Write a protein that holds these residues in place. Sequence first.
Motif, PDB file in Angstrom:
ATOM      1  N   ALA A  15     -22.475   2.864 -72.603  1.00  0.00           N
ATOM      2  CA  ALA A  15     -21.108   2.406 -72.879  1.00  0.00           C
ATOM      3  C   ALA A  15     -20.990   1.922 -74.326  1.00  0.00           C
ATOM      4  CB  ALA A  15     -20.708   1.270 -71.943  1.00  0.00           C
ATOM      5  N   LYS A  16     -22.064   1.360 -74.833  1.00  0.00           N
ATOM      6  CA  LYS A  16     -22.147   0.939 -76.202  1.00  0.00           C
ATOM      7  C   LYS A  16     -22.238   2.094 -77.190  1.00  0.00           C
ATOM      8  CE  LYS A  16     -22.890  -3.428 -74.941  1.00  0.00           C
ATOM      9  NZ  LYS A  16     -21.923  -4.596 -75.030  1.00  0.00           N
ATOM     10  N   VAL A  17     -23.003   3.124 -76.840  1.00  0.00           N
ATOM     11  CA  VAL A  17     -23.099   4.348 -77.692  1.00  0.00           C
ATOM     12  C   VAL A  17     -21.693   4.857 -77.882  1.00  0.00           C
ATOM     13  CG1 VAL A  17     -23.764   6.831 -77.708  1.00  0.00           C
ATOM     14  CG2 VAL A  17     -25.408   5.111 -77.014  1.00  0.00           C
ATOM     15  N   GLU A  18     -20.901   4.729 -76.820  1.00  0.00           N
ATOM     16  CA  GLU A  18     -19.580   5.253 -76.793  1.00  0.00           C
ATOM     17  C   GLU A  18     -18.594   4.571 -77.755  1.00  0.00           C
ATOM     18  OE1 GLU A  18     -18.543   6.051 -72.739  1.00  0.00           O
ATOM     19  OE2 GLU A  18     -19.566   7.960 -72.738  1.00  0.00           O
ATOM     20  N   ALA A  19     -18.978   3.414 -78.319  1.00  0.00           N
ATOM     21  CA  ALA A  19     -18.175   2.710 -79.329  1.00  0.00           C
ATOM     22  C   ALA A  19     -18.176   3.448 -80.644  1.00  0.00           C
ATOM     23  CB  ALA A  19     -18.713   1.330 -79.565  1.00  0.00           C
ATOM     24  N   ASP A  20     -19.263   4.158 -80.912  1.00  0.00           N
ATOM     25  CA  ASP A  20     -19.358   4.952 -82.117  1.00  0.00           C
ATOM     26  C   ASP A  20     -20.200   6.173 -81.831  1.00  0.00           C
ATOM     27  OD1 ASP A  20     -19.544   6.026 -84.712  1.00  0.00           O
ATOM     28  OD2 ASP A  20     -20.867   4.458 -85.410  1.00  0.00           O
ATOM     29  N   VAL A  21     -19.603   7.128 -81.151  1.00  0.00           N
ATOM     30  CA  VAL A  21     -20.318   8.331 -80.661  1.00  0.00           C
ATOM     31  C   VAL A  21     -20.749   9.181 -81.900  1.00  0.00           C
ATOM     32  CG1 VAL A  21     -20.223  10.432 -79.274  1.00  0.00           C
ATOM     33  CG2 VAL A  21     -18.858   8.500 -78.546  1.00  0.00           C
ATOM     34  N   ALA A  22     -19.843   9.362 -82.852  1.00  0.00           N
ATOM     35  CA  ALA A  22     -20.160  10.128 -84.105  1.00  0.00           C
ATOM     36  C   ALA A  22     -21.332   9.579 -84.898  1.00  0.00           C
ATOM     37  CB  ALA A  22     -18.906  10.235 -84.973  1.00  0.00           C
ATOM     38  N   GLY A  23     -21.359   8.262 -85.068  1.00  0.00           N
ATOM     39  CA  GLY A  23     -22.426   7.539 -85.769  1.00  0.00           C
ATOM     40  C   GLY A  23     -23.794   7.657 -85.081  1.00  0.00           C
ATOM     41  N   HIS A  24     -23.785   7.508 -83.749  1.00  0.00           N
ATOM     42  CA  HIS A  24     -24.976   7.801 -82.967  1.00  0.00           C
ATOM     43  C   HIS A  24     -25.455   9.235 -83.026  1.00  0.00           C
ATOM     44  CE1 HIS A  24     -23.937   3.943 -81.123  1.00  0.00           C
ATOM     45  NE2 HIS A  24     -25.228   3.895 -80.834  1.00  0.00           N
ATOM     46  N   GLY A  25     -24.527  10.169 -82.943  1.00  0.00           N
ATOM     47  CA  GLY A  25     -24.849  11.584 -83.005  1.00  0.00           C
ATOM     48  C   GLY A  25     -25.501  11.978 -84.304  1.00  0.00           C
ATOM     49  N   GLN A  26     -24.990  11.446 -85.416  1.00  0.00           N
ATOM     50  CA  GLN A  26     -25.609  11.660 -86.740  1.00  0.00           C
ATOM     51  C   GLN A  26     -27.024  11.172 -86.779  1.00  0.00           C
ATOM     52  OE1 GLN A  26     -22.180   9.948 -88.923  1.00  0.00           O
ATOM     53  NE2 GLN A  26     -22.905  11.264 -90.627  1.00  0.00           N
ATOM     54  N   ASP A  27     -27.239   9.938 -86.360  1.00  0.00           N
ATOM     55  CA  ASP A  27     -28.511   9.287 -86.433  1.00  0.00           C
ATOM     56  C   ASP A  27     -29.519  10.056 -85.586  1.00  0.00           C
ATOM     57  OD1 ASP A  27     -27.421   7.291 -88.070  1.00  0.00           O
ATOM     58  OD2 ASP A  27     -27.514   5.728 -86.586  1.00  0.00           O
ATOM     59  N   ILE A  28     -29.114  10.430 -84.384  1.00  0.00           N
ATOM     60  CA  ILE A  28     -29.969  11.135 -83.430  1.00  0.00           C
ATOM     61  C   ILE A  28     -30.379  12.523 -83.947  1.00  0.00           C
ATOM     62  CG2 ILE A  28     -29.999  12.242 -81.133  1.00  0.00           C
ATOM     63  CD1 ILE A  28     -28.421   9.640 -80.187  1.00  0.00           C
ATOM     64  N   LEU A  29     -29.425  13.309 -84.403  1.00  0.00           N
ATOM     65  CA  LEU A  29     -29.721  14.629 -84.979  1.00  0.00           C
ATOM     66  C   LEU A  29     -30.528  14.574 -86.252  1.00  0.00           C
ATOM     67  CD1 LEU A  29     -26.402  16.507 -84.417  1.00  0.00           C
ATOM     68  CD2 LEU A  29     -28.429  16.789 -83.040  1.00  0.00           C
ATOM     69  N   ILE A  30     -30.252  13.630 -87.155  1.00  0.00           N
ATOM     70  CA  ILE A  30     -31.069  13.507 -88.367  1.00  0.00           C
ATOM     71  C   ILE A  30     -32.525  13.188 -87.977  1.00  0.00           C
ATOM     72  CG2 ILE A  30     -31.529  12.049 -90.377  1.00  0.00           C
ATOM     73  CD1 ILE A  30     -28.414  12.146 -90.710  1.00  0.00           C
ATOM     74  N   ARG A  31     -32.639  12.308 -87.002  1.00  0.00           N
ATOM     75  CA  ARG A  31     -33.953  11.903 -86.501  1.00  0.00           C
ATOM     76  C   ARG A  31     -34.689  13.074 -85.916  1.00  0.00           C
ATOM     77  NH1 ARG A  31     -38.722   8.867 -85.058  1.00  0.00           N
ATOM     78  NH2 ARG A  31     -37.821   7.249 -86.388  1.00  0.00           N
ATOM     79  N   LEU A  32     -34.002  13.860 -85.081  1.00  0.00           N
ATOM     80  CA  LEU A  32     -34.579  15.044 -84.496  1.00  0.00           C
ATOM     81  C   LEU A  32     -35.074  16.103 -85.549  1.00  0.00           C
ATOM     82  CD1 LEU A  32     -35.136  16.847 -82.030  1.00  0.00           C
ATOM     83  CD2 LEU A  32     -32.736  17.657 -82.260  1.00  0.00           C
ATOM     84  N   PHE A  33     -34.181  16.380 -86.473  1.00  0.00           N
ATOM     85  CA  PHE A  33     -34.391  17.411 -87.513  1.00  0.00           C
ATOM     86  C   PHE A  33     -35.523  17.003 -88.461  1.00  0.00           C
ATOM     87  CE2 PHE A  33     -29.668  18.865 -87.121  1.00  0.00           C
ATOM     88  CZ  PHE A  33     -29.951  19.583 -85.978  1.00  0.00           C
ATOM     89  N   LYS A  34     -35.617  15.707 -88.754  1.00  0.00           N
ATOM     90  CA  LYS A  34     -36.660  15.201 -89.632  1.00  0.00           C
ATOM     91  C   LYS A  34     -38.003  15.101 -88.957  1.00  0.00           C
ATOM     92  CE  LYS A  34     -36.175  11.919 -92.416  1.00  0.00           C
ATOM     93  NZ  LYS A  34     -35.865  11.236 -93.656  1.00  0.00           N
ATOM     94  N   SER A  35     -38.003  14.661 -87.707  1.00  0.00           N
ATOM     95  CA  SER A  35     -39.239  14.540 -86.962  1.00  0.00           C
ATOM     96  C   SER A  35     -39.798  15.823 -86.484  1.00  0.00           C
ATOM     97  CB  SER A  35     -39.103  13.623 -85.789  1.00  0.00           C
ATOM     98  OG  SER A  35     -38.671  12.401 -86.299  1.00  0.00           O
ATOM     99  N   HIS A  36     -38.909  16.764 -86.214  1.00  0.00           N
ATOM    100  CA  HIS A  36     -39.247  18.067 -85.651  1.00  0.00           C
ATOM    101  C   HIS A  36     -38.474  19.168 -86.369  1.00  0.00           C
ATOM    102  CE1 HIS A  36     -41.374  15.797 -82.579  1.00  0.00           C
ATOM    103  NE2 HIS A  36     -40.322  15.006 -82.540  1.00  0.00           N
ATOM    104  N   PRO A  37     -38.961  19.552 -87.568  1.00  0.00           N
ATOM    105  CA  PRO A  37     -38.154  20.504 -88.359  1.00  0.00           C
ATOM    106  C   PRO A  37     -37.979  21.874 -87.734  1.00  0.00           C
ATOM    107  CG  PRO A  37     -39.686  19.318 -89.766  1.00  0.00           C
ATOM    108  CD  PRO A  37     -40.076  18.997 -88.355  1.00  0.00           C
ATOM    109  N   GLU A  38     -38.865  22.247 -86.828  1.00  0.00           N
ATOM    110  CA  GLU A  38     -38.685  23.499 -86.073  1.00  0.00           C
ATOM    111  C   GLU A  38     -37.307  23.505 -85.323  1.00  0.00           C
ATOM    112  OE1 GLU A  38     -40.589  20.922 -85.278  1.00  0.00           O
ATOM    113  OE2 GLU A  38     -41.594  21.183 -83.315  1.00  0.00           O
ATOM    114  N   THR A  39     -36.837  22.321 -84.916  1.00  0.00           N
ATOM    115  CA  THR A  39     -35.589  22.233 -84.157  1.00  0.00           C
ATOM    116  C   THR A  39     -34.372  22.638 -84.997  1.00  0.00           C
ATOM    117  OG1 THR A  39     -35.205  19.804 -84.534  1.00  0.00           O
ATOM    118  CG2 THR A  39     -36.503  20.447 -82.584  1.00  0.00           C
ATOM    119  N   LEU A  40     -34.363  22.250 -86.270  1.00  0.00           N
ATOM    120  CA  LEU A  40     -33.308  22.611 -87.197  1.00  0.00           C
ATOM    121  C   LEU A  40     -33.161  24.119 -87.291  1.00  0.00           C
ATOM    122  CD1 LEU A  40     -31.309  21.487 -89.245  1.00  0.00           C
ATOM    123  CD2 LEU A  40     -33.129  21.485 -90.944  1.00  0.00           C
TER     124      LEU A  40
END
Length: 151
Positions: A15-40
Amino acid sequence: VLSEGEWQLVLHVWAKVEADVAGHGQDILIRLFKSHPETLEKFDRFKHLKTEAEMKASEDLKKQGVTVLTALGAILKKKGHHEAELKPLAQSHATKHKIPIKYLEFISEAIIHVLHSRHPGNFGADAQGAMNKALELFRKDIAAKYKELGY
């Protein structure tokens, strides 16, 4: 199976993620792409991005982040009864996007990392365990549809 109390911890934090869904989505995808560049590399739409600052600057990245988080939010709020939500997601990710189950583990680790950064007080170890469990359930159910389809 999650307990009702575990579902509550999961949905309180969501419910809290939902306060700033765009901001969370950015952080999560940047994290994914940086940690696991194969995913990008799976995203033709994002493969031109080569730095974190380029990723942070991408409006389409932020948009797509809202998409993934929205689909996830919908699944979680089914509290396990997500058959209707998973079947199309399983088909496209197995057959069209070609996303290994391992990559769903990676994005789950990214979600947990970010949730922990942004909501420490609503995401202690108990809520982390419950979220783990919910994400594993999602993966387990997806993997079973992958195995049916021969992926």
